[PDB]
């Protein structure tokens, strides 16, 4: 006749949780831990304390040079990161090229605090006109120009040789920008600058540049056939920048003090500001998670989990749960 018993067995529950294995998929399990974060708030938030710089319809160049379609950004100072559109519409209002633009943008992603300062006031230009202007850089359907650089033209009928310098009396690196104008022909050249064969020279302790306008017949862009080329350098503390020109000089008025370097980024996104806060931002949304992995976007900034391309990552913790 049957007597006493002791059994050896194992836990089970009502769990539908599944995990994967190399030899068998979709194995039902008692306990499992998901480790892949798959959700974001679809918003562009502050990063910890700090508001991003959201350029709207402006490009970095449009911002720095002061395209009239960007007066909103005339005075930005501190940002956590930068957002720019895929194809912003307001950049170089006057057509032409920005030299070493990507190198500048890269520099810019290591900076988070600019202090704009007046380097050469218009009042300096007593023997030149400062009112060079154009329909392509218009404000309210009346012709204007970049807010930050100045288009010098002949005063009366003479354009005297320019020779001005600026010494960096700060303890912060200084970003200065300038440019040159390429006219369409000699008549146009004479009408604007009087002088016919011109140059722009720029020297620091490391830069030794000489520019010369290039006449040529070009297709129209924004109705215009002329062109403007822009340049930038970093002027170090206690160094001096020197400009010489006898025509075509687009002079700096403002320059940018680099007051804080930090980690930052220039993100490409069509989104607007979301008025929210996060510790981890991607171009398509912020992340709020303790997961060690996420799969939302590879370009992130802040304290983030690790990006993987997987749509699913879950560890078995418990054991095979029999039906």
């Amino acid at each position: 006749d049957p007597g006493d018993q002791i059994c050896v067995g194992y836990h089970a529950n009502n769990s539908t949780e599944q995990v994967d294995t190399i030899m068998e998929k979709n194995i039902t399990v008692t306990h499992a831990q998901d480790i892949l974060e798959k959700t974001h708030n679809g918003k562009l938030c502050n990063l910890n304390g700090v508001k991003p710089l959201i350029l709207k319809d402006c490009s970095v160049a449009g911002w720095l040079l002061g395209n009239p379609m960007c007066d909103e950004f005339l005075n930005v100072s501190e940002w956590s990161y930068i957002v720019e559109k895929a194809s912003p519409a307001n950049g170089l209002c006057y057509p032409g090229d920005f030299n070493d633009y990507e190198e500048l943008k890269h520099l810019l992603s290591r900076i988070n605090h600019f202090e704009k300062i007046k380097i050469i006031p218009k009042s300096y230009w007593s023997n030149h006109e400062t009112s060079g202007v154009s329909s392509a850089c218009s404000y309210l359907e009346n012709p204007s120009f970049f807010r930050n650089v100045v288009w010098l033209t002949k005063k009366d009928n003479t354009y005297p040789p320019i020779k001005v310098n600026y010494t960096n009396a700060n303890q912060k690196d200084l970003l200065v920008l300038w440019g040159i104008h390429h006219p369409n022909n000699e008549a146009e050249q004479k009408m604007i600058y009087q002088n016919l064969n011109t140059y722009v020279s720029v020297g620091t302790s490391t830069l030794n540049q000489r520019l010369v306008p290039k006449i040529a017949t070009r297709s129209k862009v924004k109705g215009l056939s002329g062109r403007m080329d822009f340049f930038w350098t970093i002027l170090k503390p206690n160094d001096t920048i020197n400009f010489d020109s006898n025509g075509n000089f687009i002079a700096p008025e403002y320059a940018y003090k680099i007051v804080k370097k930090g980690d930052s980024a220039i993100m490409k996104s069509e989104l607007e500001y979301g008025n929210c806060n996060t510790k981890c931002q991607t171009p398509i949304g912020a992340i709020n998670s303790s997961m060690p992995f996420h799969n939302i976007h590879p370009l992130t900034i802040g304290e983030c989990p690790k990006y993987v391309k997987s749509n699913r990552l879950v560890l078995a913790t418990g054991l095979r749960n029999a039906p």
Partner: protein, 175 residues
């Protein structure tokens, strides 16, 4: 099962047990009861837990992407840059998906080994004083009860104390 225990010779598990992963179910003259082993279930918590944290730690440093710009006469370096970043992303996606698959399997078999190690621990104590039915259960030849239970479990099991009684009950069936 790599160890034959779970879904092997102990087909089916116990909805009744709640206190833990591995345990017992007795049946004496007093009554019944599911009882979860603690010492074994805990060393399986400590294990699986150290696993998750080490999976995570070996992943704390891996490749991070950063946006770069290139102009229209820099297509070559641009492409090199695209390849390099897709490359590392694919490498760490392979690495994590494979680590999880490989350890998932080891985790299940770890459980299967823990169940078989518990069963065998009981079996090696009782020996001839009971019968293995082959279902993860032992029929006691002698009489066991609500303190004879707590003896096989904590390993504190005086075998000679019950050794003789069983020997007669065992041979009574034969002769």
């Amino acid at each position: 099962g790599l160890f034959g225990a779970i879904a092997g010779f102990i087909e089916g598990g116990w909805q009744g047990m709640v206190d833990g992963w591995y345990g017992y179910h007795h049946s004496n003259e007093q009554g019944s009861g599911y009882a979860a082993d603690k010492e074994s279930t805990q060393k399986a918590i400590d294990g699986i837990t150290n696993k998750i944290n080490s999976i995570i730690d070996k992943m704390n440093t891996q490749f991070e992407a950063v946006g770069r710009e290139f102009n229209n006469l820099e297509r070559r370096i641009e492409n090199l840059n695209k390849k390099m970043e897709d490359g590392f992303l694919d490498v760490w996606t392979y690495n994590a998906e494979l680590l999880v698959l490989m350890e998932n399997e080891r985790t299940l078999d770890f459980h299967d080994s823990n169940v078989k190690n518990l069963y065998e621990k009981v079996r090696l104590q009782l020996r001839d004083n009971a019968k293995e039915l082959g279902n993860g259960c032992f029929e006691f030849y002698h009489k066991c009860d609500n303190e004879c239970m707590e003896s096989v479990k904590n390993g504190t099991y005086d075998y000679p104390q019950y050794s003789e009684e069983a020997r007669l009950n065992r041979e009574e069936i034969s002769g």
